[PDB]
Amino acid sequence: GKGAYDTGTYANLFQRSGYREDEIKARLEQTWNDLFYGDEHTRIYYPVGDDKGYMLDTGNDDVRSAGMSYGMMMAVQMDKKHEFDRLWNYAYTYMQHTEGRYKDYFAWHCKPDGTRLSPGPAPDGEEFFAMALFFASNRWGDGPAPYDYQAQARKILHACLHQGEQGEGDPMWEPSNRLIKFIPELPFSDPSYHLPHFYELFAQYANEQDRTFWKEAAEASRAYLRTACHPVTGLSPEYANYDGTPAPVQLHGDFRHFYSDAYRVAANVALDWEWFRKDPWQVQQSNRIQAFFSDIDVSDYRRYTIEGEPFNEPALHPVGLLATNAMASLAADGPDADSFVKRFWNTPLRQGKRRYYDNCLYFFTMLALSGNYRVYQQAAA
Numbered sequence: 290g291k292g293a294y295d296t297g298t299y300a301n302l303f304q305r306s307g308y309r310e311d312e313i314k315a316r317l318e319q320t321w322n323d324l325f326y327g328d329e330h331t332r333i334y335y336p337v338g339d340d341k342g343y344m345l346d347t348g349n350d351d352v353r354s355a356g357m358s359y360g361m362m363m364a365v366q367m368d369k370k371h372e373f374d375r376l377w378n379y380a381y382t383y384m385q386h387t388e389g390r391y392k393d394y395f396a397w398h399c400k401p402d403g404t405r406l407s408p409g410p411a412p413d414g415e416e417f418f419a420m421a422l423f424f425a426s427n428r429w430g431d432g433p434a435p436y437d438y439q440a441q442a443r444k445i446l447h448a449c450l451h452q453g454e455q456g457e458g459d460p461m462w463e464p465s466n467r468l469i470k471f472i473p474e475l476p477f478s479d480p481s482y483h484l485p486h487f488y489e490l491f492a493q494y495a496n497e498q499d500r501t502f503w504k505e506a507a508e509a510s511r512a513y514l515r516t517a518c519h520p521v522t523g524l525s526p527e528y529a530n531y532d533g534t535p536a537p538v539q540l541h542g543d544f545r546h547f548y549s550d551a552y553r554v555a556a557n558v559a560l561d562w563e564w565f566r567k568d569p570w571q572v573q574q575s576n577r578i579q580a581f582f583s584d585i586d587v588s589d590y591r592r593y594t595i596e597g598e599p600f601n602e603p604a605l606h607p608v609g610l611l612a613t614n615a616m617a618s619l620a621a622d623g624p625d626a627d628s629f630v631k632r633f634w635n636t637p638l639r640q641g642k643r644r645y646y647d648n649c650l651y652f653f654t655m656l657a658l659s660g661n662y663r664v665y666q667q668a669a670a
């Protein structure tokens with residue numbers, strides 16, 4: 290078969306699970322309203338002035354590039370221009386470099402007021418910023434700068450591939466292997482950063498010289514994720530070497546294990562399958578990870594070695610983990626797919642100081658499983 294990119298048909302797995310259409314759309318809208326306009330123990334979005342707003346990492350009391358970029362995608366996928374523009378204005382103003390080795394990249398986290406905490410960037414932010422902006426252009430049309438969406442996107446993806454050619458700086462993609470990097474400087478990666486589905490669409494909307502690269506990178510990332518995921522459990526490390534093996538322990542933590550970052554791999558893999566249907570391995574990977582967690586309660590979620598050895602330590606984001614395991618049902622045809630969809634439906638949004646990452650993964654799963662995580666092309670509106 291052909292994917293949602295070709296057919297324009299999006300699977301409603303909640304409907305397939307037996308839930309009513311009415312119910313599903315109401316549940317999606319409520320999730321938007323709570324995360325963006327809820328109470329002080331739920332909402333993760335905060336509007337600032339008349340033309341700005343941010344997504345708060347409640348857990349770390351800072352504003353991340355990954356989070357702001359997640360927020361923009363959430364906004365454009367839900368047809369929420371006002372909120373989309375507020376977020377982008379915050380990112381463009383406070384976070385985007387206008388000079389230095391990081392010119393056109395984004396400072397990976399800052400304070401709610403906009404004061405930067407580190408200058409270095411996080412590539413998973415950049416790619417999400419780029420994809421979100423192209424969808425904004427395709428859905429709403431380019432506004433006046435800085436709301437010339439497709440132009441802002443192309444400028445970011447130019448930097449991503451070409452940052453070292455203008456004197457000093459490093460590219461976010463390693464030219465030799467066409468793989469996104471953990472950060473510009475270090476020659477290793479993060480499985481969760483690989484969005485081959487997003488790169489297919491960059492191959493359509495990026496600067497003309499780079500379109501070949503993005504198409505090659507789509508297939509490179511699909512290949513990398515086959516080497517990153519354990520062939521039994523379908524678990525993956527947080528940081529990985531280009532060969533897919535867990536990276537050495539870093540100075541800021543041990544990232545060889547299946548923890549917070551790794552959760553998004555199963556969701557990323559599943560969305561690529563839904564959109565493009567290119568890699569039949571993605572179905573098997575969805576079956577494997579679901580089968581590893583088929584027997585495990587959310588309250589019993591741990592840190593695991595990719596081999597499947599549970600640490601005594603609990604998962605920091607078990608609702609997040611359930612959401613991504615549930616999102617895998619987009620691609621899973623196994624006997625656990627139906628189970629995971631119902632399990633997620635009966636799981637509410639997280640509350641308390643650690644809620645941010647859980648609720649971000651929650652909302653993407655709510656979008657995806659309702660059939661509302663869609664490609665916005667140069668169509669006939």
Ligand SMILES: OC[C@@H]1O[C@@H](O[C@@H]2[C@@H](O)[C@H](O[C@@H]3CO[C@@H](O[C@@H]4CO[C@@H](O)[C@H](O)[C@H]4O)[C@H](O)[C@H]3O)OC[C@H]2O[C@@H]2OC[C@@H](O)[C@H](O)[C@H]2O)[C@H](O)[C@H]1O
Nearest residue numbers: 346348353355397407408409410411413472541549550646
């Ligand atoms: O913790 C001290 C910081 O470590 C150094 O590393 C930075 C990375 O952490 C960052 O990757 C970010 C981190 O946030 C990720 O999302 C997480 C998922 O886990 C949840 O619990 C959490 O709420 C959520 O935020 C997100 O996916 C990524 O975007 O990437 C940048 C990296 O930068 C650099 O560290 C390496 C160093 O060489 C550079 O100097 C620095 O810029 C930070 O230095 C330090 O502050």
